[PDB]
mmCIF file of N, CA and C in Angstrom:
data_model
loop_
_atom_site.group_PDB
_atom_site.id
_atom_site.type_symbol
_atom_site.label_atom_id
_atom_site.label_comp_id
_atom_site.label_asym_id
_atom_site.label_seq_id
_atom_site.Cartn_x
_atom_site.Cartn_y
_atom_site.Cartn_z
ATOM 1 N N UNK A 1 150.463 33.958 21.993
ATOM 2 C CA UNK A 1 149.927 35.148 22.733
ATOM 3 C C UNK A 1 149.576 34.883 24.207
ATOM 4 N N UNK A 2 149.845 36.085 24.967
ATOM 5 C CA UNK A 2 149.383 35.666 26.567
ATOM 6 C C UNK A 2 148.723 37.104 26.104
ATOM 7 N N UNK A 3 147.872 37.048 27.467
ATOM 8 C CA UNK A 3 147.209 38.474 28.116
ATOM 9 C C UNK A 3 148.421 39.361 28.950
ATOM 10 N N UNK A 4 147.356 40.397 29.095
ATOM 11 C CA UNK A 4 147.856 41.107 30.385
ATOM 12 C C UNK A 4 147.766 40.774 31.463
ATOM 13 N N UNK A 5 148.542 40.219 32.317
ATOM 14 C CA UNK A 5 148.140 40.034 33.627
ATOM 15 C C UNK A 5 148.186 41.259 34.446
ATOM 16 N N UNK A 6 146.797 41.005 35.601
ATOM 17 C CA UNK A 6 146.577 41.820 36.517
ATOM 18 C C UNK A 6 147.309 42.504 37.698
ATOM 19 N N UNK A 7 146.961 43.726 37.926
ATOM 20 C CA UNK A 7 147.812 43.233 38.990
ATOM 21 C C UNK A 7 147.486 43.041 40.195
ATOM 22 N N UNK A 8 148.039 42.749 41.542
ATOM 23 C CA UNK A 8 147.690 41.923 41.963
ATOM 24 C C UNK A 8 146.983 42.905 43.150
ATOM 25 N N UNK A 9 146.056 42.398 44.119
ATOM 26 C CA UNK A 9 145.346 43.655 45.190
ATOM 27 C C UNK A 9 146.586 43.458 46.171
ATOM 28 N N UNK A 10 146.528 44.627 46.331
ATOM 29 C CA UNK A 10 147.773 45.456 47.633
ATOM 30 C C UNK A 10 149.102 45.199 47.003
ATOM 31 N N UNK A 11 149.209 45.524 45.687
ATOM 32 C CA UNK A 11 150.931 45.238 44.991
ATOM 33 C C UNK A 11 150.842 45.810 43.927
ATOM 34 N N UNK A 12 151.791 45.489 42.775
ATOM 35 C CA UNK A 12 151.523 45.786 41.743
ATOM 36 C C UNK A 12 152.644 44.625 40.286
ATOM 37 N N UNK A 13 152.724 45.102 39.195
ATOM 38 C CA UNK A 13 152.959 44.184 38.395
ATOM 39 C C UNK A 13 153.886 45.165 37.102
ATOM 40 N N UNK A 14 154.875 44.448 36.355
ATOM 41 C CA UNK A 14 155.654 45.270 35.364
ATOM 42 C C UNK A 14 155.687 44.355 34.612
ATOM 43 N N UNK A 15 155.541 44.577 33.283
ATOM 44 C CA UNK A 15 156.086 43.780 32.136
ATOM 45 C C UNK A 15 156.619 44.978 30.923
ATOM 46 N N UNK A 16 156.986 44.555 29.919
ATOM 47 C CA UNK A 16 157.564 44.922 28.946
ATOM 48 C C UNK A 16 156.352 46.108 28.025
ATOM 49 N N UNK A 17 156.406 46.962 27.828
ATOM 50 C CA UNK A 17 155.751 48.200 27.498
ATOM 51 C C UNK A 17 156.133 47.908 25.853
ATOM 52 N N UNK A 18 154.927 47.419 25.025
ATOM 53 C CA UNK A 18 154.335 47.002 23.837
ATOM 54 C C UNK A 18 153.062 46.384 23.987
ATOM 55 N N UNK A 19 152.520 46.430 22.235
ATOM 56 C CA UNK A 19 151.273 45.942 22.219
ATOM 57 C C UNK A 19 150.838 44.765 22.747
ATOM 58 N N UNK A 20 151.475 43.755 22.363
ATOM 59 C CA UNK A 20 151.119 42.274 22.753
ATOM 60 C C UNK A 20 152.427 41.616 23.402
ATOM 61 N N UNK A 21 152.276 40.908 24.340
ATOM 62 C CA UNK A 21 152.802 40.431 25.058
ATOM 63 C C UNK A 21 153.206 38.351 24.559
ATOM 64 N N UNK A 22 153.864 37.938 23.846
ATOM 65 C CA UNK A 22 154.034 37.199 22.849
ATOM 66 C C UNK A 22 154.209 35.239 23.668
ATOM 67 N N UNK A 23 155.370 35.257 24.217
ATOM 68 C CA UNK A 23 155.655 33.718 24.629
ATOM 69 C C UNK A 23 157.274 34.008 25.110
ATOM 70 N N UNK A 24 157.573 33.615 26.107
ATOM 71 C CA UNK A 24 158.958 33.819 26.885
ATOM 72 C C UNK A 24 159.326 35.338 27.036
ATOM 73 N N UNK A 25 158.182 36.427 27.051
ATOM 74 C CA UNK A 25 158.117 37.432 27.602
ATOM 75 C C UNK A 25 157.670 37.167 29.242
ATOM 76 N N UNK A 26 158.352 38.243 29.789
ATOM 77 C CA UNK A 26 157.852 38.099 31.693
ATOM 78 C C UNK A 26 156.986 38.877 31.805
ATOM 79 N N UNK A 27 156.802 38.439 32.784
ATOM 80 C CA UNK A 27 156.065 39.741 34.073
ATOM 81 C C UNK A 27 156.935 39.766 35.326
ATOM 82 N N UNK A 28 156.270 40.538 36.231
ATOM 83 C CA UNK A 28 156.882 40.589 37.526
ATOM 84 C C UNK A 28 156.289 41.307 38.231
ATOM 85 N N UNK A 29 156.949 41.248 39.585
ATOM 86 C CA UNK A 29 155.040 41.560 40.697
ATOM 87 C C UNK A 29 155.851 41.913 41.821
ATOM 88 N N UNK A 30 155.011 43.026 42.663
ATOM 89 C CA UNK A 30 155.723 43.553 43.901
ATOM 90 C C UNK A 30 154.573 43.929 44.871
ATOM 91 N N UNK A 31 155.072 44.097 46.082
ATOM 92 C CA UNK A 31 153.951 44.379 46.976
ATOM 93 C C UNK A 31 153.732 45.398 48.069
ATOM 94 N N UNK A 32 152.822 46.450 48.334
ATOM 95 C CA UNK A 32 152.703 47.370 49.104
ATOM 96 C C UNK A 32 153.382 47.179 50.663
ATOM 97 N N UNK A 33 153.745 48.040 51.478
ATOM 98 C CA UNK A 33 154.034 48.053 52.367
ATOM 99 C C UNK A 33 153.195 47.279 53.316
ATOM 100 N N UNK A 34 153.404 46.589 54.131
ATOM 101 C CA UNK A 34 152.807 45.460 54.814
ATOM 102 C C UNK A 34 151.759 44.718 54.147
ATOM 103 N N UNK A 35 152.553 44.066 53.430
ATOM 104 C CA UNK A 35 152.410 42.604 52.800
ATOM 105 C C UNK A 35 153.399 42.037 51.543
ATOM 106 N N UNK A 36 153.414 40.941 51.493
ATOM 107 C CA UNK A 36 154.596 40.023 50.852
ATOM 108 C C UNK A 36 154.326 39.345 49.785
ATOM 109 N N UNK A 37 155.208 39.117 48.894
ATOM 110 C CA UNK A 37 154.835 38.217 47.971
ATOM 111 C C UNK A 37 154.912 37.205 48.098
ATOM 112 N N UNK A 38 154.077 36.187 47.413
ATOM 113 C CA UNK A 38 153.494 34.829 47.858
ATOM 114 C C UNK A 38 153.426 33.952 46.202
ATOM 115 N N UNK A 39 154.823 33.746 46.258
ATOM 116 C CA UNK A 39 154.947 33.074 44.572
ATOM 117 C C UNK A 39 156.031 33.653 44.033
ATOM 118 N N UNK A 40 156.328 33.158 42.666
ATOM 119 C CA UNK A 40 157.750 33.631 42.116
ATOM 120 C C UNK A 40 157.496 35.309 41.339
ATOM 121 N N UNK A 41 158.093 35.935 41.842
ATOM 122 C CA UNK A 41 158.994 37.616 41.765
ATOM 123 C C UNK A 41 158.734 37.876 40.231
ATOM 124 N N UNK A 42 159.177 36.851 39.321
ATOM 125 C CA UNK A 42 159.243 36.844 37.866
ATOM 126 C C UNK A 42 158.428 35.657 37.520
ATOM 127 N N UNK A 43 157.744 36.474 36.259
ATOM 128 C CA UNK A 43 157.184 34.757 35.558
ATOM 129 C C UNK A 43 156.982 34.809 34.241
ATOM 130 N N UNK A 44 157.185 34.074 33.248
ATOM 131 C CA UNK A 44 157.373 33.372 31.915
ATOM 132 C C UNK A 44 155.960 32.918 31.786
ATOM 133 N N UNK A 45 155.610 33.588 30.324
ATOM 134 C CA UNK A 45 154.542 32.846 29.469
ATOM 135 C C UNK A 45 154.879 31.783 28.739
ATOM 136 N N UNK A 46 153.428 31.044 28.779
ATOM 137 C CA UNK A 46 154.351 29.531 28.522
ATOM 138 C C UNK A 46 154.035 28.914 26.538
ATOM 139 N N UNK A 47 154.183 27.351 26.200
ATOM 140 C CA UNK A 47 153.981 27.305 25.053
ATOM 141 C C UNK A 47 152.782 27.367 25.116
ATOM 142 N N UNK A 48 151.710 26.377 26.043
ATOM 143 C CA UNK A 48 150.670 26.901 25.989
ATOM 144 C C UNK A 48 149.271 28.033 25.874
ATOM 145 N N UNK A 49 150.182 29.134 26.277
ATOM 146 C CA UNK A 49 148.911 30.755 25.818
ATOM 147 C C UNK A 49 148.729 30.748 27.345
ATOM 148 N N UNK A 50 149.350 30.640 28.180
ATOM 149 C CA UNK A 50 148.672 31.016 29.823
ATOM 150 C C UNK A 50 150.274 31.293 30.614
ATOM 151 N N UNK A 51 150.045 32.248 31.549
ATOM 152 C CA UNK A 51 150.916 32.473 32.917
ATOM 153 C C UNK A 51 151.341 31.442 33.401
ATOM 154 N N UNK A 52 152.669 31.353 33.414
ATOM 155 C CA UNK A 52 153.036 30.469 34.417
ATOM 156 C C UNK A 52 153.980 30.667 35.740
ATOM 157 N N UNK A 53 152.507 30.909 36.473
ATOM 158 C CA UNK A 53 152.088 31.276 37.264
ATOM 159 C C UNK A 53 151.186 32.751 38.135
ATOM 160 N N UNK A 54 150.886 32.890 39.079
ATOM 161 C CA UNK A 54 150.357 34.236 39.525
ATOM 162 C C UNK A 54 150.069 34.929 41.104
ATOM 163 N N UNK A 55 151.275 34.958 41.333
ATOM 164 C CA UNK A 55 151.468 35.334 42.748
ATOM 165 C C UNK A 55 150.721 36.255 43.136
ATOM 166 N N UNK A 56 150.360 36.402 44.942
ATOM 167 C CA UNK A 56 149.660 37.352 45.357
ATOM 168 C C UNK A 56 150.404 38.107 46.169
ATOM 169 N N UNK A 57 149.739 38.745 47.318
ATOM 170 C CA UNK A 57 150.351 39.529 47.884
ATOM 171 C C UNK A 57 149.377 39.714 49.411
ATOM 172 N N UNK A 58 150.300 38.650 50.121
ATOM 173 C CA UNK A 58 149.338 37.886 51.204
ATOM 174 C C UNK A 58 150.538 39.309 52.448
ATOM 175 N N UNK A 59 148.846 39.274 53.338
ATOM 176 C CA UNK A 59 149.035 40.718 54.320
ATOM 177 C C UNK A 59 150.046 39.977 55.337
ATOM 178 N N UNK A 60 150.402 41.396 56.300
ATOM 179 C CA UNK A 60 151.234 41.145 57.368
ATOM 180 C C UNK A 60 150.080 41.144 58.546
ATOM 181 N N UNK A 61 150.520 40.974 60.355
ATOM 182 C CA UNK A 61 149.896 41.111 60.940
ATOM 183 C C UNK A 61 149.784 41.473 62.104
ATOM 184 N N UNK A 62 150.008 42.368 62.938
ATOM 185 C CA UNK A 62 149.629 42.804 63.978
ATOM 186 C C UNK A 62 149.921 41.910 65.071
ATOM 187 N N UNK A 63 150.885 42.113 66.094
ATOM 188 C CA UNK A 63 151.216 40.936 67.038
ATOM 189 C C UNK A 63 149.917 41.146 67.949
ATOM 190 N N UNK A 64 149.505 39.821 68.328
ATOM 191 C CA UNK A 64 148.133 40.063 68.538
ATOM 192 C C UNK A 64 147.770 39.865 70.128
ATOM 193 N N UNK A 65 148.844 40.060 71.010
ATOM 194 C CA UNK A 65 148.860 39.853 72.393
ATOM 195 C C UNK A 65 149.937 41.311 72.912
ATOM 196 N N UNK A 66 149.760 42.142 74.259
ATOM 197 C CA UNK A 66 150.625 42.836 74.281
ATOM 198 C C UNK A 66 151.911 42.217 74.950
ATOM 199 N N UNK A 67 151.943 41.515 75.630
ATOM 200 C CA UNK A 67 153.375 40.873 76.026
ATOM 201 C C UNK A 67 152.882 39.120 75.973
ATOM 202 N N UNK A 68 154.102 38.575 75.841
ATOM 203 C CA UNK A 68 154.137 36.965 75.741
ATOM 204 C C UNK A 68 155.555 36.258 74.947
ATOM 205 N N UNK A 69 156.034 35.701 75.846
ATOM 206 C CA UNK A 69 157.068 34.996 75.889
ATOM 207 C C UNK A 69 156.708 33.498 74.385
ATOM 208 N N UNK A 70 157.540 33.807 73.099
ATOM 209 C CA UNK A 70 156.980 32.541 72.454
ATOM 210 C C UNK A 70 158.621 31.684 71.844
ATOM 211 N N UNK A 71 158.701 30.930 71.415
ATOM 212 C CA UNK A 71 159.568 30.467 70.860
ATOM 213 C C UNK A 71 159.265 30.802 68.899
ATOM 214 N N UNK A 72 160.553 31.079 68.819
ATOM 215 C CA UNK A 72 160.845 31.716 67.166
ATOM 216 C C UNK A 72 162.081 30.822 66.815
ATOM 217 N N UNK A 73 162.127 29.974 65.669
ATOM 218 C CA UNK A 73 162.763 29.262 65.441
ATOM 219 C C UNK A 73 164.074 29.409 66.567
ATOM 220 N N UNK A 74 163.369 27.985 67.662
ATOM 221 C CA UNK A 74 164.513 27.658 68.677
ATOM 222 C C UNK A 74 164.522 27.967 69.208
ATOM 223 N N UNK A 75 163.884 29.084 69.781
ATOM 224 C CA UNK A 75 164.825 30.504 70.468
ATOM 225 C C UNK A 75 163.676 31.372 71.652
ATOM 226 N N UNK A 76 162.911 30.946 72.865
ATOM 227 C CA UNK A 76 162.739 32.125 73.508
ATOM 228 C C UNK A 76 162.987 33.692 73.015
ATOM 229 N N UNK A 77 161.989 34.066 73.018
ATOM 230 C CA UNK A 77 161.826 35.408 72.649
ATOM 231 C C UNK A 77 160.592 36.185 73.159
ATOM 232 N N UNK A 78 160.327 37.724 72.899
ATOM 233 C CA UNK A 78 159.419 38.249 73.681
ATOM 234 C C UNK A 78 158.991 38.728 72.082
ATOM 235 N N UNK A 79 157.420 37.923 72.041
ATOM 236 C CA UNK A 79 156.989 38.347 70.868
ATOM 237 C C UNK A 79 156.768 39.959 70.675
ATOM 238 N N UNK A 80 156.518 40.999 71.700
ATOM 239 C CA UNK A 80 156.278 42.498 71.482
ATOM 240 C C UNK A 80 157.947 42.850 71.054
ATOM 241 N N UNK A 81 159.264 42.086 71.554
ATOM 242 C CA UNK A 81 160.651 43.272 70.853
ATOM 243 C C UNK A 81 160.937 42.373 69.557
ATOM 244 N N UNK A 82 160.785 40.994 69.435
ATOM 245 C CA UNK A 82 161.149 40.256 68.243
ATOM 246 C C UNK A 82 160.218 40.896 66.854
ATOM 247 N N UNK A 83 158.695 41.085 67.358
ATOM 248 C CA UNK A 83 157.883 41.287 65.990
ATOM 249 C C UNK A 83 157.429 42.868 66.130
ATOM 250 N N UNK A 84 158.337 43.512 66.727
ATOM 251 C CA UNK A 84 157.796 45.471 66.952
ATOM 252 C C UNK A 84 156.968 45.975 65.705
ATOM 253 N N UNK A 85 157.661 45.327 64.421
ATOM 254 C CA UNK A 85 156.820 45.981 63.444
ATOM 255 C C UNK A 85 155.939 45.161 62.686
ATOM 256 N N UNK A 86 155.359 44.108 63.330
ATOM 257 C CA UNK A 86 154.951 42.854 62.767
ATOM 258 C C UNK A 86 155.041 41.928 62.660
ATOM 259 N N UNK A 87 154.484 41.149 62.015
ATOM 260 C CA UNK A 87 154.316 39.658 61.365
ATOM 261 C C UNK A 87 153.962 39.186 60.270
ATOM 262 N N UNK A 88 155.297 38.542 59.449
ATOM 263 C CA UNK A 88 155.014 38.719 58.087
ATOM 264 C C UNK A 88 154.413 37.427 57.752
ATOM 265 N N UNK A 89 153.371 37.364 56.791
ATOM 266 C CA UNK A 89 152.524 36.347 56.257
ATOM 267 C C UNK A 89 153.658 35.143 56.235
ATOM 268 N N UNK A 90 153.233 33.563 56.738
ATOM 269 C CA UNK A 90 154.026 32.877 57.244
ATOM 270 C C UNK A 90 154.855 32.869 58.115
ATOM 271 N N UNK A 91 155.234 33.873 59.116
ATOM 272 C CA UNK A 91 155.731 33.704 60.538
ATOM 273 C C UNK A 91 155.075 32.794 61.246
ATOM 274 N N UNK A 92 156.238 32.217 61.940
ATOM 275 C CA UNK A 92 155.337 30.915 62.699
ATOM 276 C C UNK A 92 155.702 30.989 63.783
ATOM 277 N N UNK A 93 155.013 31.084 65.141
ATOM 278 C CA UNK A 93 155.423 31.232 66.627
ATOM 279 C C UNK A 93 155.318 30.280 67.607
ATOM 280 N N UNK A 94 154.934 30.100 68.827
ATOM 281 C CA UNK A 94 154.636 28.976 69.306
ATOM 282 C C UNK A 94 154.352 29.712 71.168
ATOM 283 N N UNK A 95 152.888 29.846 70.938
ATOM 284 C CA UNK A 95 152.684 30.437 72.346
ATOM 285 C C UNK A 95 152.590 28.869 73.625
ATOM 286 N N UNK A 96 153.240 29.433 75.160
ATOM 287 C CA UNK A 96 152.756 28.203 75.963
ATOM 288 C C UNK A 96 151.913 28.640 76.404
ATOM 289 N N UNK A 97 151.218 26.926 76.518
ATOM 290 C CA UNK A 97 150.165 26.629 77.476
ATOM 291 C C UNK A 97 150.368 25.723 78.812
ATOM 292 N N UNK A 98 149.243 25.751 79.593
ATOM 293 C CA UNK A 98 149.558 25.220 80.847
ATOM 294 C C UNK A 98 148.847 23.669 80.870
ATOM 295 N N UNK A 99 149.606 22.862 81.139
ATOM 296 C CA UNK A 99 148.722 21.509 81.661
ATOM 297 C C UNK A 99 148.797 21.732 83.424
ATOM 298 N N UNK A 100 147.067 21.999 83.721
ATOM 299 C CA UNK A 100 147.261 21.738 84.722
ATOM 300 C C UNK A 100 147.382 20.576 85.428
ATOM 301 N N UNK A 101 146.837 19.619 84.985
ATOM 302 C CA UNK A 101 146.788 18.531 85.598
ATOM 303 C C UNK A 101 148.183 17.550 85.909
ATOM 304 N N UNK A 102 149.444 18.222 84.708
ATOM 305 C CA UNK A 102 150.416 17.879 85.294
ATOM 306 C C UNK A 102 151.461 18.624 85.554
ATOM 307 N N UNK A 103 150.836 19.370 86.249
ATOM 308 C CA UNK A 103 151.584 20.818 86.489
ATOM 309 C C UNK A 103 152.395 21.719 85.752
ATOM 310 N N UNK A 104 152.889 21.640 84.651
ATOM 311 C CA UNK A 104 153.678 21.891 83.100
ATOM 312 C C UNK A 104 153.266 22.533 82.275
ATOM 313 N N UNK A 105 154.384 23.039 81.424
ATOM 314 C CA UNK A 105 153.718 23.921 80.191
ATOM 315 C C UNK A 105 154.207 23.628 79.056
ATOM 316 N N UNK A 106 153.487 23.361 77.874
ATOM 317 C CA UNK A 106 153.904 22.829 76.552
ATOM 318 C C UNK A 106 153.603 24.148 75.422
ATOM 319 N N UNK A 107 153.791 23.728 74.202
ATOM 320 C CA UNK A 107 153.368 24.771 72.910
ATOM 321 C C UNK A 107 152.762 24.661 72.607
ATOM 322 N N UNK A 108 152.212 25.398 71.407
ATOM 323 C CA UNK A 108 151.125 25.401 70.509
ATOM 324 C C UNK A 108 151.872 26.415 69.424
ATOM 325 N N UNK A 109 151.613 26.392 67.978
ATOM 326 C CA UNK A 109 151.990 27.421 66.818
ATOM 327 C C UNK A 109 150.965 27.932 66.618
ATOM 328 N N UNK A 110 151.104 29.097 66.098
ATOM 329 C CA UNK A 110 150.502 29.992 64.900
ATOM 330 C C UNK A 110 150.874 31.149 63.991
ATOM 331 N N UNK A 111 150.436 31.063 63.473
ATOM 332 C CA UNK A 111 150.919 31.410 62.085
ATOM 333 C C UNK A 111 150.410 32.883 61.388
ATOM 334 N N UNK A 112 151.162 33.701 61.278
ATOM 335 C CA UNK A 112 150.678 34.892 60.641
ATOM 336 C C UNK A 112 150.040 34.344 59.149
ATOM 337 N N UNK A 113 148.841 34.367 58.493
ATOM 338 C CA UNK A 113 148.215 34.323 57.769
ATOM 339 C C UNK A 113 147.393 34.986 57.016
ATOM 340 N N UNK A 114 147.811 36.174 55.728
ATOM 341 C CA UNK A 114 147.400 37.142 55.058
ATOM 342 C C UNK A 114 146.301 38.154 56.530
ATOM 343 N N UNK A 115 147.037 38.595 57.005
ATOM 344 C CA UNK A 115 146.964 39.858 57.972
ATOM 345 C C UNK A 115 145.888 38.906 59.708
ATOM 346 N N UNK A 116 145.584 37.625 59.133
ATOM 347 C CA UNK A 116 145.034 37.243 60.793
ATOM 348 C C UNK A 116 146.145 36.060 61.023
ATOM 349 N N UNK A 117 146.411 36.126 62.534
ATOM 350 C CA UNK A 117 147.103 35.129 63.191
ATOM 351 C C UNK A 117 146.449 34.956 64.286
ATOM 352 N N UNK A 118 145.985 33.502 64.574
ATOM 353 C CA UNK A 118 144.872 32.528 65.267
ATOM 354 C C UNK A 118 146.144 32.455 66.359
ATOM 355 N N UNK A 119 145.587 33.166 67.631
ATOM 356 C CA UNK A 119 146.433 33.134 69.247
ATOM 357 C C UNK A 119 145.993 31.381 69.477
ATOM 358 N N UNK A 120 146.803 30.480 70.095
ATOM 359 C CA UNK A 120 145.925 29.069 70.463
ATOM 360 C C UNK A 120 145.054 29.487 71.701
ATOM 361 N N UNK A 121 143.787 28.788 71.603
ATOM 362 C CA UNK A 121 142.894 28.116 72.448
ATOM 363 C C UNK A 121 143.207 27.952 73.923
ATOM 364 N N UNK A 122 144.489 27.272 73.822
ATOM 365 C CA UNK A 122 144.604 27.021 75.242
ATOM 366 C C UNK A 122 145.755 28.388 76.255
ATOM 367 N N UNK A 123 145.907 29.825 75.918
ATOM 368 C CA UNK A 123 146.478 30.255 76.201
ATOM 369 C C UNK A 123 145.677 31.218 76.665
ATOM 370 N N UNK A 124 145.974 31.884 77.810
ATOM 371 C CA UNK A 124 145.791 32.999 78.609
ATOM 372 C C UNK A 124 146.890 34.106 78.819
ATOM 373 N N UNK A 125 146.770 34.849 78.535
ATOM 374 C CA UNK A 125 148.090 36.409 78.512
ATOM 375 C C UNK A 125 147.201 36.556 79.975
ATOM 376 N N UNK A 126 148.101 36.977 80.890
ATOM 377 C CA UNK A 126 148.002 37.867 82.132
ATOM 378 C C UNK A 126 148.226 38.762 82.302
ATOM 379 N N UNK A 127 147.797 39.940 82.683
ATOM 380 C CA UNK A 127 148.180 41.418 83.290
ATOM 381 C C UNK A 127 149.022 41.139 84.634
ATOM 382 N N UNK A 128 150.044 42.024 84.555
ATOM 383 C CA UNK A 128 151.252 41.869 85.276
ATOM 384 C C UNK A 128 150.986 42.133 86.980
ATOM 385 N N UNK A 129 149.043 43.219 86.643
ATOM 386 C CA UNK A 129 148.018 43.094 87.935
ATOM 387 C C UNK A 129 148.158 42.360 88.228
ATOM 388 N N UNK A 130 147.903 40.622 87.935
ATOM 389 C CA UNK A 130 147.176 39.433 88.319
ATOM 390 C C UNK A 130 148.530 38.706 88.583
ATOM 391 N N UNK A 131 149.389 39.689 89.513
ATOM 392 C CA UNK A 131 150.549 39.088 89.909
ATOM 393 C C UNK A 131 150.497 37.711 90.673
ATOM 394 N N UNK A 132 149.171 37.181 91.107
ATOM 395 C CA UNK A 132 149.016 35.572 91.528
ATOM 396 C C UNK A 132 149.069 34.695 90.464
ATOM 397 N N UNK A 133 148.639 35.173 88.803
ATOM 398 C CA UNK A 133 148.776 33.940 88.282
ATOM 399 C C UNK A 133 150.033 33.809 87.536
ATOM 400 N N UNK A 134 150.400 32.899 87.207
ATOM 401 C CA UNK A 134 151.791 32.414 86.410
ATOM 402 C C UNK A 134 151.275 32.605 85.118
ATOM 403 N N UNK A 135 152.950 33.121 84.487
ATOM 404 C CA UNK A 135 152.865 32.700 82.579
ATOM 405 C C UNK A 135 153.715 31.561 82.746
ATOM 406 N N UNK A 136 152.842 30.742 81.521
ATOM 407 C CA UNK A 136 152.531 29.364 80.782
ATOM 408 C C UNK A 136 154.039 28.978 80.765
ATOM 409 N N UNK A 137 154.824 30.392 80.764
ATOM 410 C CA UNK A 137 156.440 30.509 79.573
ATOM 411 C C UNK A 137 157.299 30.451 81.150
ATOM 412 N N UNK A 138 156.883 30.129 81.995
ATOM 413 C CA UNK A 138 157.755 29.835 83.635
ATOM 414 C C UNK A 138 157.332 28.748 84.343
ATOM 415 N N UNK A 139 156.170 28.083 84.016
ATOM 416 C CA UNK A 139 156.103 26.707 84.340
ATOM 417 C C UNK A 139 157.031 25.581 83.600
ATOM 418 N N UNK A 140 157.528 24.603 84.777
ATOM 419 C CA UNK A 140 158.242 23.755 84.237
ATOM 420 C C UNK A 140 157.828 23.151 83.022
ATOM 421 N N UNK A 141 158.438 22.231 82.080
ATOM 422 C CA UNK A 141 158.004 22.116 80.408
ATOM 423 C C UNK A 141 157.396 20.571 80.684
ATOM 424 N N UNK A 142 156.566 20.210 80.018
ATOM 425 C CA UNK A 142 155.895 18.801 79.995
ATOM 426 C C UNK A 142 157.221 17.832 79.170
#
């Protein structure tokens, strides 16, 4: 015998419509509009009497700067036309920063993470006003 498994917050879950739910019966799990599943799609009760396994349904996130030049696997890109409708849980970006001291600009990642993605520390977005200062993403590279 297994249980019913739950389903999951911001998704939902299908199994086989009967009383008890027995041993090498599935489940399966899906997820609301902005957010993803996070684990296997289908899953098998095991010999033991338990799930094996129980995926969630980790959020998307909001690009969290209005313009900024980041690298996306390899690739220069403008995070506002690459992510227009988001950032899906595990997107990984890479905003620059400036060394001033040796005049250069290097990376930093972050990571869309169930609906927050941590901008790095060492980065400043400019208003296109503050036409004296430079982006990070036009200084020569360290």
């Amino acid at each position: 015998k297994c249980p019913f498994p739950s389903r999951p917050d911001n998704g939902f879950v299908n199994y086989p419509a009967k009383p008890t739910l027995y041993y090498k019966d599935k489940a399966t799990f899906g997820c609301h509009d902005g957010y993803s599943l996070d684990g296997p799609e289908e899953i098998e009760c095991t010999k033991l009497g338990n799930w094996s396994a129980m995926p969630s349904c980790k959020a998307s996130c909001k690009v969290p700067v209005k313009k900024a030049t980041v690298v996306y696997q390899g690739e220069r890109v403008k995070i506002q036309e690459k992510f227009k409708n988001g950032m899906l849980h595990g997107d990984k970006v890479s905003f620059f920063c400036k060394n001033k001291e040796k005049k250069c600009s290097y990376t930093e990642d972050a990571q869309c993470i169930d609906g927050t993605i941590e901008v790095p520390k060492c980065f400043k977005e400019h208003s296109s006003l503050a036409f004296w200062k430079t982006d990070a993403s036009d200084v020569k590279p360290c």
